[PDB]
Structure formats: C-alpha cells, structure tokens
Design a protein around this ligand. Structure first.
Ligand SMILES: [Zn+2]
Lengths: 267, 523
C-alpha cells in the first residue's frame, strides 16, 4: 500500500526535503522563481492558501506526482508543513497573520463524473464537475479539543477530530478519571464548516438518465467560495461515511459517500 | 537691536497701556499667549486686536493712535518702513518682534520709535550705515541685501527667554515655545540644522524644569504638565486616526512611495507585509489597536522603512501628558491650531475664527482642540487628493525655468486653498511629490508657481511661489521681487496685502502677460 510506504519516517523526510527544494528552486520558462512571487502575493493580501499546479510538480518530481493521487492525506499534510516552513523563512513575521498554510492542487490530469464513481475511488484524490444546488451557512466545528480532568484540574493535550467519527479522550497521567472529562471554550481551537451539494450539469446529463448529486464539505479558507447555481470544478478526497438510516431504509447495509473538498475553481 | 529686555522693554511698559497686534500664525499665537501670561502676572493692562494685512494694520493703528502710546507688534511690520506709512509721533514707541530677516534698513537705523526686539546674534548681514545713508554702490548693496525673504528665529522662543530672565517661567510657557518651534518646522521655514540646534536648547530647558527625582516625581500628582523629549516618527496625527490613513496621507511616506500610483499602493502593501502587522489592526483606530503590536512599533517601522528606501522616518520632537487620558504631540497641536485659524465652513466671523484658534491653546478648551484635529485630518485628505489629481492628469507644465500649475474652478475642495497657509502647504507637498515622481534631472531643481481662483466675482486669482527643492535648501525665496518687477513691467493690477511678499493677488486678464514677463525676467 502506498499509504504504508509514505508513512515511513525516512520516506516522510525525503518527501519533505524534495518538496522544500521544489518550492525554493523552480524556475519558469523565463527562469523566474514562481513560488517566490506566489508567496509574496499570498502574504501581501493576508491569505493562508497557496496553489500548486500538478503539471510542474510532475515535471520536477514524478515520484511525488504519482504518490499524491493515491495517498492524498499524509502527502498534503507534509506539503502544508513544508510550505509553512518556506513561508516563515521568507516572511519571519507571518506567524501573526496566519497559523497554518494550506496547499491547493490545480490541474489534476484525471477528470471523472458524478455518475461513474464506485468503490474503486475510495480514499483517492478525484476531480469532478457540476452545478451547486445547496449551500448551508458557516458553522463552527471542533478542530483540536482540549479535554480536562476533574480529579486533578489538569487539562489533557490536543486531540484532533475528523469528519467521520466522534473523538474520545485519552488517559490522564496518574488519576484515571476517564468519565469526568469536559471541554473548555477558551483553549479549544475551532474551524469553519460548510456543506455544499453539487449535482450533474444540465447539458451533460444523459437524456434517459436523471441528474445525480453528491455532498461536499468545505473547511477553513474554502468556505463562501461558492453560491447556489454556480458551475464549479471540484477537487477533493472521495470519502466513505457510514449511515445506518440508509441501511434501515433500503433494508440492506449501505454507506453514505461525501467529498472532502480541497480545491474549487469557478468556470 | 535691543540688547537688554529686562530693563529696556518690560520696565518701560509695566505702568502703561499696551496694545498688542498679532499676525495670524501659530508662532505668533504662542508668543501672544506667553506675553499675555506675563502681563496678567504683572498686572499690566493691554488690548489685544487681530491684524491680518497691511491695510488692516494701518486702519487699526489709525483707530487707536490717540488712546495708546506704547505699541507692540508680533510677527508683522518689520520688513518695511513702518515710520513712513504710519507717521507716528515722538512719544509713541514701537516694539517689534517679527521673524522676517530682510529687515527694513530705515527701521534698523533709528532710535526714536522702532526698538526692534529681533536678536542680533542671528545670521543677518547688516549693510554699512554710511553706504546707504550719508550712489550706484548703494543700489548694488540694496540688491545684494534684499534679494531673498528667508525667515528667522521663533518669536515664542524670545518670549520664553524674556520670561526666563524674570524667573516667571512655567511649563505652560515652555510648551508654547515648543509649539512655536514645531510650527516653524512644519511650515518648512527654517533649515534642519537650525531646527536641531533649537531642539537642543529647548531640551536643555525641559531637562531643567522636569527635574526628575525618585519619590519626588512619584509622589508628584497626575494632572501636572510633564513635557518630555521623544525621538518619534515622521507621521501626521498617527495617534488619532488609523496608522494606515496616516501613512497614506502624510508627505514623506506619500512622496517616497509614490502612493498616488497603483505601483505605489502595491509597494505600500509589501511594506506593511514586511513589517508584520495584520491589515485589520492597521486600519483600526490607534487607541484600539492591540498592545502587542504597539510595543516596539518605532524600531520595526524604521527598519522596514530602511529596506524600502525610507531613511528620515524619525524626527526629534516633544510630548505632553497632563492627566489620565490627555496626551499630545507638538505637530498635532500645530495642525489643530492651523485648521482652526483657516476655516471655510466658518468663513463667517473670521475674527471669531482667530478667537477660537487662540482659545484652543489653553488647557481648558480641549474640545476646540479635538475639532481642530478633525479639521486637520480633513485638510490633509483634501490636499493629498488634490496632489494626486494634479500629478496624474499632468496639469503641471514646465513653462521655462519655473513650473506653473493652475487649479480649475470645478476642482473639488478648491475653496480650502484660497487661504494663504493652505495654499503654501499644497504647493510644497505638490512640489515634493512631483520631484519624487518625475525622472527629468533638470526638472528636479526647478521652482513651482501655483495659482487658485481667489474670487470669482472680481476675477482675481491668488498666486504663490516657493524656492526650488534641494537636499539642504537655504529656504531663501526670490519670488516676491520678481513678481513685483514683472507686475511693474506689465502694468498689472496686483495687491501685496499679505505680510509675505511671495503671495500676491492677480486679475485673470493680466495673467498671461504677467507669466510671460516673469519667464523673460527669470531667463
Ligand atoms: Zn487527572
């Protein structure tokens, strides 16, 4: 599995160094350093999102360009860390205006349709297109929860939360008060949340068939980048989420599917 | 030429009825405040009447020529022969304390009525008495002596010295002297070296008065004036409105970064990013910004300015903190008082404009000071917009050796510049911005002659001119003499009511011939 190989510490460090070298040393057709200008424009307008084109990444690193579409989570995390390091080197004071630099992947060679997604595409970086039909408001979501212990008043460390399950607390050093654990509102870190709904294009839908739809999740800078009735090109991680209600309804164990959005382009 | 002030000036007028005539400028107002403090302390009756121009000066002298004998004039009536125009008597004694250096020769050589309080240790080249009064050599000396109109030492400093000799000096008088000096600096009437020397002198006085000691300045209560020396930034009113607007509307930062152009805006954004301050905090009011961002603002601003080609971003000035919340800088007071003096919405009751300007300088009229600060912000924004409009649309034409620009009637905020000081400030700011923007080496060392529609009904346009900009200029201006000669040559209808000969009025009809004659004369 590519996930196991990229999970290796030495492989992780090698990928980190390769991405740092790619960011620092990538000349253009005229020799200009593209990422210097990109980071300058990003920090000049107080953004926290850095776009990366897949074509030049493949041109300068084919191994990583092959690893990415198969393990899009850890690879993107390493890319984010390397980008943050490079930005901090270039702009030492940017730790005030931002706390995490995100990497957005553009021009992914593979393009699919909402009607041809099967279990083969699970946990893979896919690229689809469609028309937005629904857009909920921006709600806050728990990013890193800081559980406390009533037995000792000491507060446990951060616990990352995913969009697929409910995070549970760990173990206190010596007084094992697993039960009496709560959440404080002044140290927990939150993040923006928005769940859009995309459907097939009016022109591209088969006459005999009916339009299909899939749910997408937008977080952090991605929120409020779409409005209902807009044609978009969505790149994200196809993700599988259990839904017992559908199981009971259909009478057969079935799971819901959602897309964790990573890059959105409006055409 | 008066050598002693404790015996030849004060004691002469202690038991008499003085009449004070004060010209409309911040330095004159500060000197008047100090003189009023001394007079009220010594139980001396006086009458304070505003004087604006030569005609008003003559009329007001005629009104009170009999009721009073001793006359004191501040920042007026020293570059002309007052005796000939006023026609005074033997009893009348005129004390004159004015900053204009080209003093009239007749008033210099006279012991009857004109007892000049102007210091004799200044850079003044007095011509020989025998050469002038005892013939072509006399004309040569006249032309070599009255060529320029450079200003001199501050009146407020002389008043503070007079108070110091009498031991009746308080913190309130020192603050007024500081405000007068900073007013001279802001208008750019004194050289940088002279400003530094005067700042050193006032720093010595401040160190004398504010004799800090442990448990003496700790048990000392708040609400006592505490003037201190501060090496602060070169931004205008940056402690009242947001830092962003202060940067975008000043004169050093706007000219250096060429903020009138879009590339200037991009460079400004890069500068702010290099400093390391969020755009949200920078656009908020200075009193509501985060504490952490205001810890070492001066040093980081200086460094990031040094990277972006900005060197002289720090200047030496003073402060004041009389209470829990009140805290100002000298330039803030200068801008507020200047705005209150020259107002267009309050064009009615100009004497009341002077009254409000004078009242704003007391610690019991802070509300008027705040209104002055708001008006100064509006004035700065207006002059910045006008400068940008003039530069972008190329309304400045290099008509020979001197540049000529005319403000159209339909141009917004044109009524603000009918006033003299506003017009001068606009002229200097526009010249500096244009010099920073243009690339022609020859054009960078040329003077500017700005105009404005003074009065529509009579077809009179006000005209002004400033000396060419240079790294270390002598502040000497020859525009008055050239204007007068060109007016005589063209038989033009011009008026010299203002105490500065560089500012004259001119009819619309006589504009073209006057300009052509000036071009020919300066050639
Ligand atoms: Zn515990």
């Amino acid at each position: 599995t590519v996930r196991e190989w990229v999970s290796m510490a030495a492989t992780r460090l090698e990928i980190y160094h390769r991405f740092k070298n790619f960011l620092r040393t990538h000349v253009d057709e005229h020799g200009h350093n593209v990422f210097k200008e990109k980071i300058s424009d990003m920090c000049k307008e107080n953004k926290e999102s850095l776009p990366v084109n897949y074509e030049d990444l493949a041109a300068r690193e084919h191994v990583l360009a092959y690893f990415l579409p198969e393990a899009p989570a850890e690879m993107l995390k390493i890319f984010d860390e390397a980008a943050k390091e490079v930005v901090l080197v270039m702009y030492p004071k940017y730790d005030r205006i931002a706390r995490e630099i995100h990497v957005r992947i553009s021009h992914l060679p593979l393009v699919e349709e909402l009607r041809s997604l099967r279990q083969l595409h699970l946990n893979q970086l896919i690229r689809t297109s469609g028309v937005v039909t629904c857009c909920t408001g921006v709600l806050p979501q728990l990013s890193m929860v800081k559980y406390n212990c009533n037995k000792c008043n000491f507060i446990l460390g951060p616990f990352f939360q995913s969009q697929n399950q409910e995070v549970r607390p760990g173990s206190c050093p010596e007084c094992q008060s697993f039960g009496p654990f709560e959440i404080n509102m002044e140290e927990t870190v939150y993040q923006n949340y928005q769940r859009i709904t995309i459907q097939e294009s009016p022109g591209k839908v088969a006459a005999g068939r009916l339009p299909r739809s899939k749910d997408a999740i937008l977080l952090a800078d991605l929120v409020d980048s779409c409005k209902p009735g807009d044609e978009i090109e969505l790149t994200g991680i196809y993700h599988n989420n259990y839904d017992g209600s559908l199981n009971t309804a259909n009478g057969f164990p079935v799971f819901a599917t959602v897309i964790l959005a990573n890059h959105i382009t409006k055409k | 030429f008066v050598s002693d002030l404790r015996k030849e000036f004060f004691d002469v007028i202690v038991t008499e009825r003085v009449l004070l005539l004060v010209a409309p400028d911040v330095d004159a107002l500060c000197a008047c405040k100090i003189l009023q403090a001394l007079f009220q302390c010594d139980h001396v009756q006086y009458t304070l009447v505003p004087v604006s121009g030569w005609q008003e000066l003559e009329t007001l002298f005629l009104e009170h020529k009999e009721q009073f004998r001793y006359f004191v004039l501040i920042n007026c009536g020293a570059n002309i022969d007052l005796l000939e125009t006023l026609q005074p008597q033997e009893e009348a004694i005129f004390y004159i304390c004015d900053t204009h250096r080209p003093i009239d020769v007749v008033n210099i050589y006279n012991d009857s009525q004109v007892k000049l309080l102007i210091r004799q240790d200044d850079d003044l080249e007095i011509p020989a008495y025998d050469d002038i009064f005892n013939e072509a050599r006399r004309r040569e000396i006249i032309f070599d002596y009255e060529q320029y109109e450079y200003h001199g030492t501050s009146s407020a400093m002389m008043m503070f010295e007079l108070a110091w000799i009498m031991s009746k000096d308080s913190n309130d008088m020192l603050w007024w002297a500081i405000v007068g000096l900073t007013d001279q600096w802001v208008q750019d009437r004194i050289t940088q070296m002279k400003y530094v020397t005067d700042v050193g002198t006032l720093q010595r006085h401040v160190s004398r008065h504010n004799h800090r000691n442990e448990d003496e300045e700790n048990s000392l209560s708040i609400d006592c004036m505490r003037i201190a020396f501060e090496y602060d930034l070169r931004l205008s009113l940056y402690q009242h409105w947001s830092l962003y607007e202060s940067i975008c509307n000043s004169c050093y930062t706007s000219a250096t970064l060429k903020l009138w152009s879009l590339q200037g805006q991009k460079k400004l954004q890069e500068f702010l990013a290099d400093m390391g301050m969020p755009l949200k905090q920078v656009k908020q009011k200075f009193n509501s910004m985060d504490i952490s961002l205001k810890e070492n603002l001066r040093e980081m601003l200086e460094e990031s300015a040094n990277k972006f080609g900005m060197k002289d971003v720090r200047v030496q000035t003073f402060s004041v903190q009389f209470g829990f919340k009140n805290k100002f800088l000298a330039s803030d007071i200068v801008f507020a008082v200047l705005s209150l003096l020259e107002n267009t919405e309050r064009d009615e009751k100009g004497t009341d404009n002077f009254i409000k300007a004078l009242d704003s300088l007391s610690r019991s009229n802070l509300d008027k000071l705040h209104t002055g600060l708001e008006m100064g912000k509006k004035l700065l924004c207006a002059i910045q917009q006008t400068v940008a409009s003039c530069i972008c649309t190329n309304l400045i034409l290099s008509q020979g050796p001197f540049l000529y620009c005319y403000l159209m009637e339909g141009t917004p905020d044109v009524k603000m510049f009918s006033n003299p000081i506003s017009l001068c400030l606009l002229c200097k700011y526009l010249l500096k911005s244009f010099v920073c923007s243009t690339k022609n080496k020859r054009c960078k060392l040329l003077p500017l002659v700005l105009a404005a529609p003074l009065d529509a009904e009579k077809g009179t346009v006000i005209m002004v001119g400033i000396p060419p900009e240079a790294e270390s200029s002598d502040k000497k201006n020859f525009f008055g003499r050239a204007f007068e000669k060109a007016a005589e040559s063209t038989s033009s209808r011009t008026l010299h009511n203002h105490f500065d000969m560089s500012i004259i009025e001119l009819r619309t009809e006589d504009r073209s011939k006057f300009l052509d004659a000036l071009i020919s004369l300066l050639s």
